[model samples]
Target: SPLLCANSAKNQRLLDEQKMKVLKWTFVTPREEFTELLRDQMMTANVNKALIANMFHDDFRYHLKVIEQLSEDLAGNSKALVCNLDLILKWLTLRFYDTNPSVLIKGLEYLVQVFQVLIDEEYILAENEGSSFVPHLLLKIGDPKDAVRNGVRRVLRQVILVFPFVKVFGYVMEGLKSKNARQRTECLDELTFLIESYGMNICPQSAVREIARQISDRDNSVRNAALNCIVQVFFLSGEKTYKMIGHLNEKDLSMLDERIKR
Candidate 1:
């Protein structure tokens, strides 16, 4: 804290020059000490601008290797800095940016906990853009465990809410192709909801046709779920949806009806 305190008394011009000095402390300072500084500095009512600016400037100053280690360490110790989670998330997400795939697997597991702590837009957006971490998020979404899948889905929905352009069509398309009935069903439901919420124009012809074919599938319930959304989507967004689905012949309609056991 001596270094931070010392810099606090300096003028703006002098503080700018000392950016590297504060960064060195951030990377080299003990975790407990740096955390205390973050807690004391980030959570205060009247924040010290120079101190924070310094931390941001040289965030990667510490051995870059320490970024992932520090992220893993901080993620596991949720209780270490409870109130200043905003700052914690900022660094933790950055850690994933440089982490290798092997370390990323572990980093992502902890990051899931990190995502759960976020119940706001700012944290959600920062994690998505700062780390470009969607691939890992989708990997977890495909986890066979129901709780893990749902947790990932909930966060995925939140990300969609914050960033409308988060093109997740690939995930949906992959799910539709999955051999698991449940995964395909859930993927279909999610795709319909996504189209409804964001509009169906985002989907491709193949996706629409694929879902339409599944509507007549053996499982009555899955077929019905697909049927339920198809007409409504086509009726509401007829032109765009139709264009994507192209011209379906009478045979196509009959084939679809047969699949749903109509």
Candidate 2:
């Protein structure tokens, strides 16, 4: 498998050709056949972890074909195919840590496709980790690559259109704790979206605390984003005011309390 193969020209070329084979069928075949092919390939990849790794390589276009075909499956009402695609999900998530920028970018693209289908189908969750990729997407919206960052933002906004705002905040909060400043800022931006949609109640006490703490972030952009959410937190809650107050210092608490009192 290419995963264990040494980084060599022939091996790389082989992987590229394999991906091209997959991509070629994506355009030539009917939607049903295309999905069946992806399903078969996914089953094979699941059995071979190395194959899964190869799927993420920068030179391999397998993930794009997966996204395009899977999106078609969902649009065509192939619910069972997607619901049973846990193997596919596992591989897609594993690529989040791929060092290859193209792999990471494609991973996000696949995730976005999945969420779009989930929304279109209106699939109900029962504690499944289907949405686990959300936080990863949130963290990467500030990715250095302009294309990657923009794609993340576009998909996330589309998700918010159908997915419950509350369901999204848990992962968004985890993103806030990221050591990367860009990640933290992106999370704060997500907070604003949630607040606008579902109000501060979308923010739990812990998340509220994190938001308050960020009000003092060294980056002006981050502080502004944090302050934007904090102000909404005040208007969105009355009795739960303690969520914000408990996390702030005397000076900050006084400022917030005065605003809430008005």
Candidate 3:
């Protein structure tokens, strides 16, 4: 607030220098005060520019540690702290893809901590955030590193368990047609989890049609995944699943019928 109230040119420059001092002190400041300052100044243009530039100057690991500590400190007051989630998630996800598993692991670790805190709150992400977190994290399901891949999977499961899966269904749907088979399979796996954990009530009928299309694929693995999707839908929503069967071609239906019989 003082930064915005600097009326004279000399005072404004002095205030600017003072703010930079606070940013410089960020690492050395007590963790509690640093988090408070970070949250308070999150929206200030100059502060964010200086903070990020310094925070990520030469090493992302140091940046991640700052975020991890901030998340740890804020974890307990998530409801009050929810407004800052978009800023934090944006900072992490913007750089997520370019980093190694080591950095990704720390980023995911910070995300998990923040997410676990928000899970208890009635509302999760803010309006500007939407459900991009789902797809962004889903993209990591095929990460080259086992630890990173599994960590993403674990975080996704936690997300699906906490957030309304229906809100994330669109992102999951996008993954169904991914060029990468691994992405497609993981998407289907997540869809199955969504159906089982929640129900088919939130699923769109078009999704059934899409999954039915996969049953006709020449690849056995994809076909098997499609069949698995149908079984989960059928078991979870028998009438709903049956109603969408017409969307499938007769041959696919026959194959589905045969699979169900087995």
Candidate 4:
């Protein structure tokens, strides 16, 4: 603490530059010391700025509420510097993997807002950041709670808006291929939500391909969800859906023909 004290004369130094300097050393500093600095200096002067680090602590259920409040404050506050964005994102990303369901549920909600700050501000996340960290959110598709599933959709849309369409669509495909059939079903269910949210005019054609490919999914629910997407997309785009999903076999085409009338 004395070394830190020597760096500043003012007992209360809350300079934006100081915040940036403190967070910048996060990469090189010893973990315990950096946490001490964060706990002492960063969380003290501004509760909103530092409360984001509270994920490291045991939660109050209201902790989820605070994470979102922190996200909202972080996005719009004039004094808030996205100082050391990597560290900020790193902390958020780590929360997704937590063993506590509270962590996953609330973390998903908080990320919904954080990605908003990123995209609207045009903040860039390097490969170490969003790209690798994102797909893990989809692992929640099978979660029983509506809030959790809905949170994934909300965050997924933020990701779609921020990232390229192909990359985002590929994420859905990866979910479709999940070894967990329950997850595959949810991904397919979510896929229809994506098409309905964007509608076929703006939704990617590759979606149709994936939807069609899953028509024969061994699981009945996967087949049901896949066919449901096909019908939804077909209804929205008519015959155009058929062409994109060019590989449908005779009986499968019959399945498409029965439910969705052209």
Question: TM-scores of the models, in the given order?
Answer: 0.45, 0.62, 0.70, 0.63
Model 4, range 202-247, lDDT digits (tens) per residue? 4567757867898887788888888888998887888877788868
How many residue pairs clash per model? 2, 0, 0, 0
lDDT of 1: 0.50
Q: Which ten residues in a row have the lowest lDDT in candidate 3?
A: 1-10
Ranking by TM-score: 3, 4, 2, 1
Report clash pairs, candidate 3: none
How many angstroms is residue 103 displaced in model 1 relative to the true structure, after the best TM-score fit? 16
Clashing residue pairs found in predicted model 2: none
Stretches of candidate 2 exceeding 4 Å from the true structure:
1-77, 99-113, 157-164, 238-243, 247-262
lDDT of 1 by residue, 1-262 (tens): 3111222222332243256433322231135554454444453423335435444453444423433443555444544333334344434434433423443444445555555545332433433242333433554444555666666577667556544433675556666665666666767777777777766566666777777767656666566666655665675665565455545656656654464343
Where does candidate 4 clash, by residue pair? none
Tell me the deviation in Å of residue 88 in model 3: 0.4
Q: What is the lDDT of residue 215 in candidate 3?
A: 77
lDDT (0 to 1) per candidate: 0.50, 0.59, 0.63, 0.63
